[PDB]
Design a protein around this nucleic acid. Structure first.
Ligand SMILES: [Mg+2]
Ligand SMILES: [Mg+2]
Ligand SMILES: [Mg+2]
Ligand SMILES: [Mg+2]
Ligand SMILES: [Mg+2]
Ligand SMILES: [Mg+2]
Ligand SMILES: [Mg+2]
Ligand SMILES: [Mg+2]
Ligand SMILES: [Mg+2]
Ligand SMILES: [Mg+2]
Ligand SMILES: [Mg+2]
Ligand SMILES: [Mg+2]
Ligand SMILES: [Mg+2]
Ligand SMILES: [Mg+2]
Ligand SMILES: [Mg+2]
Ligand SMILES: [Mg+2]
Ligand SMILES: [Mg+2]
Ligand SMILES: [Mg+2]
Ligand SMILES: [Mg+2]
Ligand SMILES: [Mg+2]
Ligand SMILES: [Mg+2]
Ligand SMILES: [Mg+2]
Ligand SMILES: [Mg+2]
Ligand SMILES: [Mg+2]
Ligand SMILES: [Mg+2]
Ligand SMILES: [Mg+2]
Ligand SMILES: [Mg+2]
Ligand SMILES: [Mg+2]
Ligand SMILES: [Mg+2]
Ligand SMILES: [Mg+2]
Ligand SMILES: [Mg+2]
Ligand SMILES: [Mg+2]
Ligand SMILES: [Mg+2]
Ligand SMILES: [Mg+2]
Ligand SMILES: [Mg+2]
Ligand SMILES: [Mg+2]
Ligand SMILES: [Mg+2]
Ligand SMILES: [Mg+2]
Ligand SMILES: [Mg+2]
Ligand SMILES: [Mg+2]
Ligand SMILES: [Mg+2]
Ligand SMILES: [Mg+2]
Ligand SMILES: [Mg+2]
Ligand SMILES: [Mg+2]
Ligand SMILES: [Mg+2]
Ligand SMILES: [Mg+2]
Ligand SMILES: [Mg+2]
Ligand SMILES: [Mg+2]
Ligand SMILES: [Mg+2]
Ligand SMILES: [Mg+2]
Ligand SMILES: [Mg+2]
Ligand SMILES: [Mg+2]
Ligand SMILES: [Mg+2]
Ligand SMILES: [Mg+2]
Ligand SMILES: [Mg+2]
Ligand SMILES: [Mg+2]
Ligand SMILES: [Mg+2]
Ligand SMILES: [Mg+2]
Ligand SMILES: [Mg+2]
Lengths: 77, 46, 58, 103, 94
RNA sequence: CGAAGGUGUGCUGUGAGGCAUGCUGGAGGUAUCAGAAGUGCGAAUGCUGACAUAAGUAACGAUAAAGCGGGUGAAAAGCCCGCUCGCCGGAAGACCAAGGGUUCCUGUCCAACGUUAAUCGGGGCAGGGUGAGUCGACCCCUAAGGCGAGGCCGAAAGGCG
RNA sequence: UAAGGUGAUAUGAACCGUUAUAACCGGCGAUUUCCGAAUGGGGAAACCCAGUGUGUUUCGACACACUAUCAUUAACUGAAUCCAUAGGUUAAUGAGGCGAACCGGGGGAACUGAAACAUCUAAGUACCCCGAGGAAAAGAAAUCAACCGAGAUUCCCCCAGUAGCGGCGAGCGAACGGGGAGCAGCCCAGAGCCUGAAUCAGUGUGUGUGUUAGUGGAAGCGUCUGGAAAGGCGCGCGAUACAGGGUGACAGCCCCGUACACAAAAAUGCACAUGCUGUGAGCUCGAUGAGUAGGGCGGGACACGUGGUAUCCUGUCUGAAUAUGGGGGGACCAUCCUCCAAGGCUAAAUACUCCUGACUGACCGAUAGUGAACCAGUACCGUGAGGGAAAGGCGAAAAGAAC
C-alpha cells in the first residue's frame, strides 16, 4: 500500500468543500517516490518507497540510522 | 415448460458447499450465523 | 488390583488374546438363536478394557 | 441414609388400609414401596400366546408412598420415627422414642 | 502380514437366508456380515485362521440402511457390509 | 356438609351491575378499606383457530374400449386366471447417463392415501435382495476456468498473478 | 455414600450386589475413530492419494511416528561477481481458528427534521475490518485558575439546557468551580562511589480460609364428615428449625429439607514468611526527547459551522533557540502568573454477561410468556443467504376395562 517506510505516513480521509459548503468524501495521499539509497556499510544500493519528508529525514539523520530503526520495527528492505 | 430448478450435485456442491464457504471469507459469517442459530444442516452437503 | 496389576506384560497380552477369542465366540453364538446369557459380552468387554488400560499404565 | 428398607416391618399411616401391618418387598427410586398384601388392585390381565398365559383377574399389590408408612416398634405396639446415630464408627438407625437401636 | 486382533474384530456375524443356503448347498459359499473397514485380504485371512478353512476369493458388497418410522420419528438403519466367502472344494463348515 | 368456572331461575338498583339459589363441575376463592394497571371490543378489505353458506352443485383430470366365464373374499366391473375387442409400436418398446434414494421381491394389513369401492397399488408393518483385475467411479494427463508458496498492488478486508 | 441397581421413551430377557472393587457422586488419570484452524498433497466435509524413518514379517507385506504455511533465532552449503549479499536445507520457539456483550482504533451513509431542500441535523449513529484485555482506553501537568490559589487519571450529582455555535432557522451544546467513589507514583534518555541493598515478582514450602463429593439435624394422638385427612372438633410438644416442596382435600411435629453444629484421601484459588535462579536500591555530579515546535495551502476534531476564532493532529512546502530558552492564560501586543512537549509503565472507583451457584418479583400462565413449557430454530418453504410454525393437562395410584 501507499505507506512511508520511514515516517509511517498512510493515506487519510477528508472532505472536499465547495463555495456552498457541500462536503464530498476524499482522500489525501502521500507523495511517495521509489528511490535508491546508497548504503556505504554494505556497499550496495537499497530501494525504499518513501515520501519527500522521509527523504529529508534521511538527509538529516542518515541512511544507517533509518535502516537500524526499520530493522528494530521489523520492516524488510 | 422448463422450470428454474434443474438439479446437479456437482454444481450444487461447488457453490453451496462447505469447502467453498470456508473460502470467500463472508461465507464464514454465513456458517457462523447458522451455528449460532442452531441449524441442523449448515450446508447442503450430504 | 483385580489380580492383574501384579502380572506381566506377556501374560496380559495372552489374556488379551484369549478374551478376544472368547468375545468372538460369544458374538458368533449370539448371532444365531442359541445364546442365552448375554451378560458375558459386557463382562468380557469390560475385562478387555481393564487389561488394555493396565497395559497403558505399564 | 434411607429410613425404610426392604426387610423392615412397617405399618400404614394413611389410606384405605391404615393400621394394617405387613412386610415390604422392594424399594423404588420414586419414593414408593411394595408391602405384602396391603394395597391390592384387581388388575385385568389379558392372555398372551407367549408363556402360555391363561389370563384372568389377578390380585396384585400396588405401590404406596414412603411418607404414608413408618417403622413399627414391636416393643410398644406403636409406630415410630427413624433417626441416625453412630456406633463403633458405623451409621445405624434408632427409634426417636425410647432410643432403641433397630436389630 | 495381518495381526490377530484385527482378524478377531473384523467379523461381525454370519448371514441367514434362502439365497445364502442355496449358495452354500450349490456352490460352497458362505455369507458373512462384517465390519466397514474390512477388506478382502483381511476377511480371507480371518476365515483361514479362525475357522481353519481354505478360501480362494471373496466377494464383498455394501448394504444401504433402510429408513423406517418408529411411531412418528424417522430413523435410518446402519449401513452394514456383506461378504461372500467361497470355500475351496473339500472344506465344510457351519 | 362442595371453591373458581359453566348453564338456568328469582329478586333488586336510574344505570354500568349486584345478591340468593337449582344442576353440572371437583379445589381453590376472597369481605371492608387503600394502592398499581397489558382494566372493559362490533367494526380497522384487523390476526389466529373452529364452524356455516352457496351444495350434496360442478367436477371425479385427453372420446385408445372394452365384454364374458371361473377363483379368493363379508362384499368385486376396478385383485388373480382364461376366451374375445381395441391402442402405441422411430413407441405409449428395450437399455442408460443426469436426477431421485428402497419406491426392487415376498409374506401380511386395510385405520389415513388413490379424486369412488377395493381382497389391489409406487399406501402401512415385517423379512429379503445390490457379489467385478476386464463396466464405471478411484487413478495419469491436461482445456475453458478456479486457488495460489514467494511476488506486485491496495485505507483494513483484499485484488491480480 | 450405600442396599439396592444395569440412563429415558420402555416394558421385558439376561445378570451384579446386600457391610463393601454392585450401582451412584467428586478429585486425579488413560483411551479419546473421521471431517472441521485441519497443519503430508488434493478435495464435490466426514473422502481420495502419498513420501521418509524405525520396527514385525508364516515373504501376502503389515504397525507406529514424522512430513502445511508465516515470523524470530542458530549452524552448514551458498548465484549472477572474486571477498559479500540475494536465495536454498535442517533444528528450536510463538501464534494462525472459535466466541454473547464491553473497549480502542482504521473506514463510514441514507430514509427522517428543518413542515420543500443543498449549509446543518439525523450521526461519527447503523454497518464493514483489525487488535487486546477481564476490564480496555486514559493517566502524573509545556493542566486549570487569577495575583488568592487547586495539584495525575477515571466515574456520579450540580453548575445549565446557562454562557455560547448555528440558512442565529430547525437544532447542537459546554466550560470554571463545588459536592461525592476511589487513590501510589515512577523509570530511561549517564557516569562515578558505596554493593548486592528496598524491589516487582513467573519462584519452592508450610500455615489459615474457601471451592470441587458429603454427615447429624428437634417435636402428635383420638373422633367425625369423607373414596382417601393434611380439614373440622379436643387434648400435647419442639422451635438459633412455622424458608420451601412432596405425600389420596389446606401438615411446624409423615418425608426431603431448613435454622444450627461438622467433614477432604487428591487437585486448585485467595492472604503471610520462607535459602530461591535475574531484579537494582541509596548518594554525588551532569543532561533534559529536531525535520519537532511554529508558519503557508487546501480538511477534520474541540458546544465552536473561518466567523475577529483562541487550542490538538497532519496530506504537501518550508522551517529555530534549545535554561539567559520555550509553551499556555480564546484574534493580537506589553506586563504578570503558571508549566517544561517533541520517550514510556501504572491497580481503584467505571462498562457487560454465551455460561455457574443461591434468592426475589403488586412479571406471564399455552393465541400470554424466549420463535420453541411437547424430540424446535424441528417439520416445512426457498437452489441460497434466509424465513419459520402449529401442537401441553385421564386418574391419587394404570388399578389403562379379565370375560
Ligand atoms: Mg453527509
Ligand atoms: Mg470372482
Ligand atoms: Mg354442588
Ligand atoms: Mg382467579
Ligand atoms: Mg358463578
Ligand atoms: Mg358455582
Ligand atoms: Mg383483596
Ligand atoms: Mg386491552
Ligand atoms: Mg370478538
Ligand atoms: Mg373483524
Ligand atoms: Mg352442503
Ligand atoms: Mg350425484
Ligand atoms: Mg345451483
Ligand atoms: Mg346442474
Ligand atoms: Mg356432472
Ligand atoms: Mg363430470
Ligand atoms: Mg381418469
Ligand atoms: Mg371424463
Ligand atoms: Mg367378472
Ligand atoms: Mg375400468
Ligand atoms: Mg393399430
Ligand atoms: Mg410413426
Ligand atoms: Mg423427491
Ligand atoms: Mg416406504
Ligand atoms: Mg412392486
Ligand atoms: Mg405387497
Ligand atoms: Mg371397507
Ligand atoms: Mg378409498
Ligand atoms: Mg389427487
Ligand atoms: Mg409398499
Ligand atoms: Mg464392488
Ligand atoms: Mg476399463
Ligand atoms: Mg490453469
Ligand atoms: Mg502471498
Ligand atoms: Mg488468483
Ligand atoms: Mg435401566
Ligand atoms: Mg470406593
Ligand atoms: Mg471416578
Ligand atoms: Mg491432511
Ligand atoms: Mg490442506
Ligand atoms: Mg424534510
Ligand atoms: Mg458529523
Ligand atoms: Mg504561587
Ligand atoms: Mg453533532
Ligand atoms: Mg443429611
Ligand atoms: Mg428432620
Ligand atoms: Mg386430624
Ligand atoms: Mg380433589
Ligand atoms: Mg504544526
Ligand atoms: Mg509541520
Ligand atoms: Mg495557527
Ligand atoms: Mg502549543
Ligand atoms: Mg497565545
Ligand atoms: Mg487573554
Ligand atoms: Mg522535553
Ligand atoms: Mg511526560
Ligand atoms: Mg407460544
Ligand atoms: Mg387453555
Ligand atoms: Mg427466491
Amino acid at each position: 500500500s501507499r505507506v512511508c517506510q520511514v515516517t509511517g505516513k498512510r493515506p487519510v480521509t477528508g472532505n472536499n468543500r465547495s463555495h456552498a459548503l457541500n462536503a464530498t468524501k476524499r482522500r489525501f495521499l502521500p507523495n511517495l517516490h521509489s528511490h535508491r539509497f546508497w548504503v556505504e556499510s554494505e556497499k550496495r544500493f537499497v530501494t525504499l518507497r518513501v515520501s519527500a519528508k522521509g527523504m529529508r529525514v534521511i538527509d538529516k539523520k542518515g541512511i544507517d540510522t533509518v535502516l537500524a530503526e526499520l530493522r528494530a520495527r521489523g520492516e524488510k528492505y | 415448460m422448463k422450470r428454474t430448478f434443474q438439479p446437479s450435485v456437482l454444481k450444487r456442491n461447488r457453490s453451496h458447499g462447505f469447502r467453498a464457504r470456508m473460502a470467500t471469507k463472508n461465507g464464514r459469517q454465513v456458517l457462523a450465523r447458522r451455528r449460532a442459530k442452531g441449524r441442523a444442516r449448515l450446508t447442503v452437503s450430504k | 488390583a483385580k489380580e492383574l496389576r501384579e502380572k506381566s506384560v506377556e501374560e496380559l497380552n495372552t489374556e488379551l488374546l484369549n478374551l478376544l477369542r472368547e468375545q468372538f465366540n460369544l458374538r458368533m453364538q449370539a448371532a444365531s438363536g442359541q445364546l442365552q446369557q448375554s451378560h458375558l459380552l459386557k463382562q468380557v468387554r469390560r475385562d478387555v478394557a481393564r487389561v488394555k488400560t493396565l497395559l497403558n499404565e505399564k | 441414609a434411607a429410613k425404610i428398607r426392604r426387610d423392615d416391618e412397617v405399618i400404614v399411616l394413611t389410606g384405605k388400609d391404615k393400621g394394617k401391618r405387613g412386610k415390604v418387598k422392594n424399594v423404588l427410586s420414586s419414593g414408593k414401596v411394595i408391602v405384602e398384601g396391603i394395597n391390592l388392585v384387581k388388575k385385568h390381565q389379558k392372555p398372551v400366546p407367549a408363556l402360555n398365559q391363561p389370563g384372568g383377574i389377578v390380585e396384585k399389590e400396588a405401590a404406596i408412598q414412603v411418607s404414608n408408612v413408618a417403622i413399627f416398634n414391636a416393643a410398644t405396639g406403636k409406630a415410630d420415627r427413624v433417626g441416625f446415630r453412630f456406633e463403633d464408627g458405623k451409621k445405624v438407625r434408632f427409634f426417636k422414642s425410647n432410643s432403641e437401636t433397630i436389630k | 502380514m495381518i495381526r490377530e486382533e484385527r482378524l478377531l474384530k473384523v467379523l461381525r456375524a454370519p448371514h441367514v437366508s434362502e439365497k445364502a443356503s442355496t449358495a452354500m448347498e450349490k456352490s460352497n459359499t458362505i455369507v458373512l456380515k462384517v465390519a466397514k473397514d474390512a477388506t478382502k485380504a483381511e476377511i480371507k485371512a480371518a476365515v483361514q485362521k479362525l475357522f481353519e478353512v481354505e478360501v480362494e476369493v471373496v466377494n464383498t458388497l455394501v448394504v444401504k440402511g433402510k429408513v423406517k418410522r418408529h411411531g412418528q420419528r424417522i430413523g435410518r438403519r446402519s449401513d452394514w457390509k456383506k461378504a461372500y466367502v467361497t470355500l475351496k472344494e473339500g472344506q465344510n463348515l457351519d
